[PDB]
Amino acid sequence: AWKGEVLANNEAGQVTSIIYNPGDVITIVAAGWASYGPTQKWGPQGDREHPDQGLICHDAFCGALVMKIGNSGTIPVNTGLFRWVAPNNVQGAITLIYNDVPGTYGNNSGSFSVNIGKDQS
Amino acid sequence: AWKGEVLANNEAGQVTSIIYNPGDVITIVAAGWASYGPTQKWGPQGDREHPDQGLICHDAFCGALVMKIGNSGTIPVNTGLFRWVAPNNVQGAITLIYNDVPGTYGNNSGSFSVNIGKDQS
Amino acid sequence: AWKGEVLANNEAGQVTSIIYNPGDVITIVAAGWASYGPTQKWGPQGDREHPDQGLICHDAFCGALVMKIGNSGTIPVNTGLFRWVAPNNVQGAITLIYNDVPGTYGNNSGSFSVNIGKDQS
Amino acid sequence: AWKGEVLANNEAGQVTSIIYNPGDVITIVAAGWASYGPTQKWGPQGDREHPDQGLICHDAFCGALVMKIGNSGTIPVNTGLFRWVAPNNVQGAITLIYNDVPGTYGNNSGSFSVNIGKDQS
Numbered sequence: 001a002w003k004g005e006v007l008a009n010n011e012a013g014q015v016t017s018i019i020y021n022p023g024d025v026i027t028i029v030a031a032g033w034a035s036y037g038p039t040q041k042w043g044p045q046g047d048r049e050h051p052d053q054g055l056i057c058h059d060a061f062c063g064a065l066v067m068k069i070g071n072s073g074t075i076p077v078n079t080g081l082f083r084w085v086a087p088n089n090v091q092g093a094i095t096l097i098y099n100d101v102p103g104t105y106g107n108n109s110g111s112f113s114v115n116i117g118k119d120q121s
Numbered sequence: 122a123w124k125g126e127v128l129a130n131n132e133a134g135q136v137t138s139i140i141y142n143p144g145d146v147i148t149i150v151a152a153g154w155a156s157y158g159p160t161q162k163w164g165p166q167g168d169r170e171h172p173d174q175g176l177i178c179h180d181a182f183c184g185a186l187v188m189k190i191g192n193s194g195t196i197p198v199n200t201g202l203f204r205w206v207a208p209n210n211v212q213g214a215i216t217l218i219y220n221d222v223p224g225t226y227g228n229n230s231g232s233f234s235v236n237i238g239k240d241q242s
Numbered sequence: 243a244w245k246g247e248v249l250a251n252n253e254a255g256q257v258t259s260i261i262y263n264p265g266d267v268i269t270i271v272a273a274g275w276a277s278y279g280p281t282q283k284w285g286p287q288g289d290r291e292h293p294d295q296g297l298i299c300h301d302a303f304c305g306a307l308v309m310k311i312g313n314s315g316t317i318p319v320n321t322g323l324f325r326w327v328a329p330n331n332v333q334g335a336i337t338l339i340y341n342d343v344p345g346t347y348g349n350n351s352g353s354f355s356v357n358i359g360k361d362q363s
Numbered sequence: 364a365w366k367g368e369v370l371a372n373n374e375a376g377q378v379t380s381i382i383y384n385p386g387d388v389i390t391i392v393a394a395g396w397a398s399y400g401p402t403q404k405w406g407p408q409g410d411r412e413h414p415d416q417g418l419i420c421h422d423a424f425c426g427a428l429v430m431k432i433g434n435s436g437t438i439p440v441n442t443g444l445f446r447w448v449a450p451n452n453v454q455g456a457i458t459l460i461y462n463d464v465p466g467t468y469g470n471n472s473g474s475f476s477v478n479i480g481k482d483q484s
């Protein structure tokens with residue numbers, strides 16, 4: 001499995017050691033507090049009251065945890081995924097990213113602690 | 122494996138089908154939005170800015186997800202637990218509960234979608 | 243997980259540290275060579291040609307690996323079990339036993355090496 | 364997870380749907396009766412008394428179950444493998460093969476019933 005920290009100000013995202021392969025079943029658990037600028041902080045689900053001003057992932061609130069598997073587009077992770085299987089043709093290294101508008105990561109703070117494990121399959 | 126919702130206004134708590142046994146390893150994932158009264162809603166980690174006014178679990182914020190195992194005291198769940206082992210002598214059915222002051226659940230709203238599974242060991 | 247040897251001459255059987263609980267999914271892999279008397283040896287499947295002269299397990303060949311969960315009847319194991327679930331709520335420690343006629347274990351030789359682990363459930 | 368039969372007379376071997384990947388942990392359980400010629404039949408461990416006359420796998424008895432992972436050499440399987448990790452660089456589809464001398468599979472009979480699964484990691 002993989003365990004690490006995903007910083008809110010890390011625009012490129014945090015590359016994990018998990019390489020999702022076809023047929024793999026994975027489980028993710030995320031926790032912690034982060035912010036997209038304001039002094040207030042939000043959990044892995046982000047800010048439910050903030051407008052989407054061009055986030056890297058439109059299927060998740062601003063300040064939420066999302067991911068990219070290999071070359072895929074962003075995928076919502078939020079508080080995590082339970083025994084999850086990726087869509088067809090989706091594979092490669094897993095990168096965890098804080099959901100924010102491109103180019104604005106500079107004033108971000110906090111981070112999410114995340115566990116990723118492969119389940120039986 | 123168990124999946125269900127935990128209503129915030131349910132003071133008694135949501136009983137699952139999971140019976141934790143000595144040596145068991147479990148993984149929990151929780152998501153959703155709930156409130157301990159205010160119009161705003163918080164994730165499974167609760168409101169980090171709200172004071173503790175006699176919560177059922179002092180190890181977690183008001184509005185966070187907690188649990189009891191058999192006759193044990195409240196245990197912080199928050200966003201979930203990754204391949205987690207219970208303390209010695211802790212066993213029995215797992216009951217998921219919204220962290221709030223007893224007798225005040227009346228004005229709660231929302232719920233959490235929670236998954237619980239047993240891992241290999 | 244549990245790993246150990248099961249001697250063919252051990253009539254009482256080999257008690258393991260595995261405590262099977264209702265709902266548990268288990269996997270077992272047995273290997274090795276043993277005999278119920280003759281000079282040659284057989285695998286965990288036993289002797290497919292030998293007649294049943296009053297074996298402790300009538301659902302398995304003589305010289306095969308069987309087991310008991312708690313105080314239940316014997317259960318065929320053979321080469322092992324793959325993600326196996328018990329016949330409705332059989333509970334207790336797992337005892338591995340060489341399949342032979344009671345009171346004749348005296349001239350047995352060899353043993354089986356066995357791994358037992360609980361799977362995700 | 365894969366489940367199928369491996370015929371003793373299939374020299375090419377049986378291709379499974381299991382693609383082994385770096386870091387993968389797998390469990391195999393094999394059962395049944397097969398023969399490399401004689402009218403007798405042996406289990407997945409083969410004939411412990413038979414000499415090696417040029418078997419595809421010199422680390423297992425004749426009549427034993429073995430496998431190939433991708434372009435790797437033969438690897439002993441016998442009754443199976445418990446939470447097993449492959450040697451470095453070894454990866455690719457898993458092909459199950461009956462252990463025998465090349466060009467002699469003609470007079471073989473029987474088969475092995477095999478279950479392959481991936482464990483959590």
Ligand SMILES: *C(=O)c1ccc(O[C@@H]2O[C@H](CO)[C@H](O)[C@H](O)[C@H]2O)cc1
Nearest residue numbers: 036037038051053062100101104107
């Ligand atoms: C008003 O609704 C408002 C409050 C705070 C805020 O912060 C910016 O949010 C952007 C994303 O929408 C981006 O992350 C900026 O860097 C933040 O300063 C925007 C709007």
Ligand SMILES: *C(=O)c1ccc(O[C@@H]2O[C@H](CO)[C@H](O)[C@H](O)[C@H]2O)cc1
Nearest residue numbers: 157158159172174183221222225228
């Ligand atoms: C203070 O400004 C403040 C105090 C309470 C509150 O809501 C109540 O919180 C209680 C827990 O501390 C309990 O859940 C009550 O039922 C809520 O009404 C908001 C703001």
Ligand SMILES: *C(=O)c1ccc(O[C@@H]2O[C@H](CO)[C@H](O)[C@H](O)[C@H]2O)cc1
Nearest residue numbers: 278279280293295304342343346349
């Ligand atoms: C017949 O060919 C035959 C009968 C018995 C035998 O050995 C005995 O088998 C018993 C179980 O059927 C028991 O295990 C005795 O202790 C063995 O001596 C071999 C061949």
Ligand SMILES: *C(=O)c1ccc(O[C@@H]2O[C@H](CO)[C@H](O)[C@H](O)[C@H]2O)cc1
Nearest residue numbers: 399400401414416425463464467470
């Ligand atoms: C010696 O007692 C003996 C030799 C061969 C035999 O059967 C053959 O075994 C070969 C492998 O060693 C090969 O599989 C042949 O096709 C078999 O006929 C039985 C006993």
Ligand SMILES: [Ca+2]
Nearest residue numbers: 036037104105
């Ligand atoms: Ca920002």
Ligand SMILES: [Ca+2]
Nearest residue numbers: 157158225226
């Ligand atoms: Ca309340």
Ligand SMILES: [Ca+2]
Nearest residue numbers: 278279346347
């Ligand atoms: Ca005997």
Ligand SMILES: [Ca+2]
Nearest residue numbers: 399400467468
């Ligand atoms: Ca042959």
